[PDB]
Amino acid sequence: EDGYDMWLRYQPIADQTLLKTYQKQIRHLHVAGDSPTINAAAAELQRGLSGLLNKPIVARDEKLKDYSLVIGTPDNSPLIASLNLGERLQALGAEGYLLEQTRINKRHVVIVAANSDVGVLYGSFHLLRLIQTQHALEKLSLSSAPRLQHRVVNHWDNLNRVVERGYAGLSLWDWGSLPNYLAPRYTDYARINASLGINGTVINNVNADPRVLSDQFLQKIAALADAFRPYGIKMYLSINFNSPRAFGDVDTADPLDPRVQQWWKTRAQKIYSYIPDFGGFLVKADSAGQPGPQGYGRDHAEGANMLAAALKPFGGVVFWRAEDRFRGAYDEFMPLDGKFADNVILQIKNGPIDFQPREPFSALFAGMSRTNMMMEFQITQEYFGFATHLAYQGPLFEESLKTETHARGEGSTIGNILEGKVFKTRHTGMAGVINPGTDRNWTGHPFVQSSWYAFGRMAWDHQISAATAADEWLRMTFSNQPAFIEPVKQMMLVSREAGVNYRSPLGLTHLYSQGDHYGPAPWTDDLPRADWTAVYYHRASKTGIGFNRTKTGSNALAQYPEPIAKAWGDLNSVPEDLILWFHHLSWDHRMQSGRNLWQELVHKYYQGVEQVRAMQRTWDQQEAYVDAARFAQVKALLQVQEREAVRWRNSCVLYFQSVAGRPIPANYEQPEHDLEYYKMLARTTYVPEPWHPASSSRVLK
Amino acid sequence: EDGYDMWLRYQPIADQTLLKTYQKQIRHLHVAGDSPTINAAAAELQRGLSGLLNKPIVARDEKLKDYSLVIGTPDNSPLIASLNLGERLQALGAEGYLLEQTRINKRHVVIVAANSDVGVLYGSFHLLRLIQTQHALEKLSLSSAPRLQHRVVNHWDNLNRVVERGYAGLSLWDWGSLPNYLAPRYTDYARINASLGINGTVINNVNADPRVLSDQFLQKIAALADAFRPYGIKMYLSINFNSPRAFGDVDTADPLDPRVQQWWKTRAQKIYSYIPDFGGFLVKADSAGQPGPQGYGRDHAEGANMLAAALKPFGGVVFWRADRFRGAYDEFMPLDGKFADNVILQIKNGPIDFQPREPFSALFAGMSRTNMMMEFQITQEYFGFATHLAYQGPLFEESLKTETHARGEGSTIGNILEGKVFKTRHTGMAGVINPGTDRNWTGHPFVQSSWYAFGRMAWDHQISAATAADEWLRMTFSNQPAFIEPVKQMMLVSREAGVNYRSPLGLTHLYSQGDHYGPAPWTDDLPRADWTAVYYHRASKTGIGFNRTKTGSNALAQYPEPIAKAWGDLNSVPEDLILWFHHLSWDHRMQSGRNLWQELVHKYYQGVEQVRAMQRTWDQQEAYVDAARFAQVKALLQVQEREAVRWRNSCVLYFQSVAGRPIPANYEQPEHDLEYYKMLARTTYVPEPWHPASSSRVLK
Ligand SMILES: CO[C@H]1[C@H](O)[C@@H](O)[C@@H](O)O[C@@H]1C(=O)O
C-alpha cells in the first residue's frame, strides 16, 4: 500500500465468517436512476462491493432480485417510492439518507434511500463504511443528516503550485494542462471528500492571487468544478479584495464606490457563466499585507456586504475570515454584529491566536448573536510538525466542539453554536485547512489522513468523538484486528497531547521559530511586531511566567460569558491546561500534582518526549497487522519525531531554565549541550517545507 | 498505467505464440552469487521473468535444471566458470556482459555472463529488454560493453525540494525523513537508471547549496548512496566553491591558499567516511553569480585542480562545467593540458545553452589534452516544460554523429567522447533529467523516452534515435507493429517540430526571459545584451542573422578548417544552421526556391502543422494504449498545439514588424496582432513551480 486510496480501501473482508454473511446479504446492486450523481454512487458501490465482497457486483436497472442493495430517491426509483417512507424521509432533508434492511415484494433488500441524489451518494458511502468497518447489516435501520450546511475544505495553494503550510507535495491542480486534461486524480479527490459528506472546496490560497478571476483561469477552474459536481462538491475561490485594481479596470477597490460594486457584479456574472452552481468566495482581508476594506477606510461589513451583493442573485455566499493580541478578533468584529448580510458567514479559527496546539475557544463564537458563523480548523500540521510528526487532530477538534461556552445557558457548546441552535442563524458550516498535495498518499505523513477523516466526520456530526472517528479510520485504512485497533487508537488519541507537551504545555503558546514554524524558538524577541515574538506571550522572568488576562491585566476574560470569566479568572477553578493564557504566576505556585510551576513545566516537557517514545514502542508492536511499506514509513517518521521532540524539550527547558535560574530536577536526563547549542540548532536544522524561505537558508553556524 | 514503472513494465507477453516459446526456454533462474549487486539482479529477473512469462520464476542456488537462465561471473558461478569463456568474455571489461544460449553439463541454458557483478546486472536488464521487446532467444549470442566510463544523470534540485528547470514535481529526495526513511522510490530510481547502465548521479543543483557538505546532510546523502550502491550507481555532489567561507572556517576560498587546500582535503575525508565509494564533485563556477576561482583572480585549472587534489587519494573525480558564441572556446583553450588527470571538463552539446538546435561546441574539437564529457538536457527547459511532446533522441543522435574534422575524418563527437580521437583518461556523458515526485517521474509521459534514449546512447553513442524509440515504445506501450511505426515517426519528428515553431534556420534564444516557456523574440533591454533575443537574430528591414564568418566575429575560426570552410561558404552551409553564421538579406534564395523571409514563414507554419499531424497520429492509436495514458497524451498535445500556434504567431508577427513583408496568402493569418501577443507573453501561465514567472500577477 502507498496510501493513494486513503480510507477507501476496497479489499476483501478478512473475517471469513463475516464475509460470507455479507455475500449472502448483498448479491445484487439495483440502481434505477441515471443522473451524474446517481451514476457516481453506482460506480462507487460497484467498485466497493466488488472489492469488499470479492465477487463481481454490477449496478443494474432490472427486475428486482432477492438479496439486493437498492438505491435511490422516491423520484428516481419506483422501488424506493413503493415503501412509502413518508415522514421518515422528511426528517432527512436535502442531504440526509436512510439505510435499512427491509422487504420489497417479498424480496430481501437493503435500501439506501434519500430525498436527493447527493443524499443517495452520502448514504452509499455510509453503507460501504459499515462493511469496511465490519458492522452487521442484519436488522440495519439508521438514518442520518448533516448538522452543518457548508462542510468545506480549504487549500492554501499558490498558482505556481507551491502550497503555503503545505507538507504533502505540490498543489493538486495542474494548471498547465487544464482545462484540457481531466486527470483521474481530480475525481479521486472528489471521491475522498464526498465519502465524508464534504460539499465544498476552496482550492486557492487565502493569500489570494487575482489571476483566479481571469478568463484564462476560470476556464481551468470550471473543468475542476465539472469533475467535482457529480460528487456534490461546490467550487469556491479565495479572492483578493484589490482585484478591480489588479485587473486595471478601476483605480480603487473601495467597496462603497459604485464602479467597484459593479466590477464585482460583472465578475460574478462571468464566474457563474462558467460555473453555474459556484459556491462563492473565501476572503482574507486587511491581515498580513492582504488588501481589504480598511485600506479604503471602510469596515469589514461594508466590504463583505459588497461582495455578498454581487453573489446574492446567483445564490453564492461569502466566507469572511475573522496591546493584547488575544483580544483582537473580538474587539474588531463585535461592533459589527448584525451588520453583515444574510449570505455572509464569518469564518473564525477555533482560538483567538493561530491554531496553536491548545487555545481557549474564540470569544466571538459566544458573543456574536446576529451574525452567521462557521469554524475554521487546521489539519495540515503547521504547528504539529509538518509531515514528520504523528499528530491525530481528532482530539483537538472534539475538545473544541464539546467546549461549553455558557453563552446562553448550559449546552452552549461550540458545536451547538455552529449548528445554529444557540443564536438562531441562517448559514452554518466548518472549514478544514487540509493542504494536501501530489505526494502519493496525499498528506505526506500517513496519519495526517486521520485528521482529514475526523474533520469531515465531525463536520457531518459535531458530536462524533475523536475515538469513534479513529476506530473507523483505522479499520478502513489498516486493519479490523481488535488487538491492533485498541493500542493504535490510544496512540492516536495521545498524539495531540504529546505535541502540546513537548512544545508549550500549561497554557504556553507561540514558541515556534518564526516564520517557518518547524522547530522551537522560545527566546524569540525583536521582530517588527512584538506579537510576532515568543517572549510577548510567555513573559517569563526570574520570578514567574504567564500572561495576565484577568481584570488586573488585559481583561480579555471579560470578552467571555460571565461563567467562563469567573471559572478561568479564579485560580481555584481555572484548568491547568489553559492556566498561563490567563495568569502570570510565580514559579513557586503549587500545581494539583504537588509540583511547583517550574517543576510542572519541566515534567510536561519531559512527558511529551516520553509519550513519543511510548508511541514508537506501540507502533513496533503492530508489525504483524500492517503492510511492510507503511509499517516502515511510520516507524521511520516516529524516529524523526522523537529526535525533534528531544530538541524541542531541551531547547525550551534550557531556555526557561536560563530565565528562572532553577535546576532541572536530578531524576531527569540532563541535556549535555547548552542553550547556545540549541540556538545554533534552531538556525541550522533543515526546515522540511518547499514554501517557507527557511528551507533555503544556508546558515551553518 | 500511471507511468510509475516507466519502461520496466513486466506484463505478460501479448503474443501468445512467442510467450509459449519464452516459457519453454526459461523455466528456472539459477543464481549462485549473493553479493548485494547479484542479489539486485536476481530480484530484477525474478520479478521481470515472472511478470513477462506469467508464471512464478524464483531465483535459486540449486543443482542446475534443464532450461535455465544462469547468471554470474566466473568468480561467483562455477557453472559460468566451467564454460571457460576466456578472452571472449574478458574483452568485455569491467561493465560488459555476454548473453548466450548454450549448454552446461548437457542442460539447455541461457547465460548472463560478465567479469563483474555490475556487468551481470547490466546484462540481466538487457536480457529482460530482449523479452520486453519480443526478440527471439533461440541462438542468442550477443555481447556488449559501454563506450563511455562515466554515464551520469544530473538533477538541478534545491534542498527545499524545488527543482530548477523542473517540470515533473518536487525533488525525489525527502530530506526531512532522511536518513531514517529508506523510501522504496529511492530503489526504484536506482532500478530505472541501472536498467540503462547509468552508473552515477549528481543529486543536487549546480547552483550549489553549501549545506550538502555538512554532517547533517552527509548523513542523509549517505542513506541515498546506500540505496544506490547495489545498482552500481555512484554518488556525486554539486559543490559551492565558496564553501570554506560559508562554513565560517576560512576568510577566503582562493584555491592557492593552503588553508583552503586543507579545508577541501579535510572535507573530502569527511565525505569518504560516510560514502567510501563517493564519485566526486560537479562544479559550476564563476557563471551567473556562482562563486569560483576567478573571484580570487585564479583560473579554472587552479580551482579544479585544488578540488581534484582533495579527491585524488580517494579515487574521486571533478566534473568541471565549461560574441557570446565564442565564450567557452576562448576561455578554456588556453588551459588545455593544465587540468589534472582526475578533472573532466563537462561541456554542453552547443556553445550557447541547450537551444533546440545549436552547432557543436568547438571545445570538443579543440581540447586535445584535457578529459571531456558531454552534457545533454532531457528536462524540457527549451522544449515546452511538461506540456510539449519532444523526444530528444534525434538531438542527441545529431550531436553524437556530427563530424568535427578535429583530426580529419572520423572525428565525430561520439568518437571524441569515446577517446578514439585524442588520447584521454576519462570519458563520459551527463544528462540533465530533473525528474520529480509526479507519479510518472517526468510529468509528460514522453519525457521518459528522452531519459531512455540518453541512457542507451551513453552506453553506445552510435545507437540511433529510431532504435531507442522502437525499444522504448515496445517496453512502455505496445509491441503491435501498427502502433510502433507511426508513433516512432511521431517521436522522431517531434524535436524538429519544436525547432520549427520556435526558431528555425539557425535562429536561437527567442524565449521569454528568464522562465523560458513562451516566445519573446522582441526582448531587448536586459542588464546584459547577450540575455536578449535581438542580440542573436539581429533582424532588420534588410535582413537577419549573425555574422560569425571572417568578416564578422570569426567564431568559425574556432572550428577545424574543414568546418570553417563548409559553414563559411553560403554554397555548403547547412540551412538548418545558416543564421548562426551569416547575416543575410531577406531576398536571399533558399534551396526550396523561397526567399529567406518566405522560408522563415514556411518553417514556423510547418512546425504547427507538424504538431497537428502528431495529434492525428496519436488519435489513431486509441486501440493500442490504455485509456488513461491515451487521454493524458491526447490532452497534452492539445495544449502543445495551442502553444505552438502562440509561438508561430508571436514570432512571425514580430519578424514581419521588422521586415515589413507580407505573410503569403496561402498561410492562415494570425488570429490577432503583435501587441496582443506581447500581452499573451505577459499573461500566459508559466507552468513551473521554480521560476518566479509562475507567480506573476500581471494581467495586461
Ligand atoms: C495562509 O496564511 C497563514 C500564514 O501562513 C500563517 O503564518 C498565519 O499568519 O496564518 C495565516 C492565515 O491563517 O491566513
Ligand SMILES: CO[C@H]1[C@H](O)[C@@H](O)[C@@H](O)O[C@@H]1C(=O)O
Ligand atoms: C541551473 O542553471 C541553469 C539555468 O537555470 C539556465 O537559466 C541556464 O543559465 O543554464 C544554467 C546552467 O546550465 O547552469
Ligand SMILES: [Co+2]
Ligand atoms: Co500512507
Ligand SMILES: [Co+2]
Ligand atoms: Co510560493
Ligand SMILES: [Co+2]
Ligand atoms: Co448556506
Ligand SMILES: [Co+2]
Ligand atoms: Co502509545
Ligand SMILES: [Co+2]
Ligand atoms: Co524549583
Ligand SMILES: [Co+2]
Ligand atoms: Co506516463
Ligand SMILES: [Co+2]
Ligand atoms: Co527554489
Ligand SMILES: [Co+2]
Ligand atoms: Co574516470
Ligand SMILES: [Co+2]
Ligand atoms: Co506524426
Ligand SMILES: [Co+2]
Ligand atoms: Co517577400
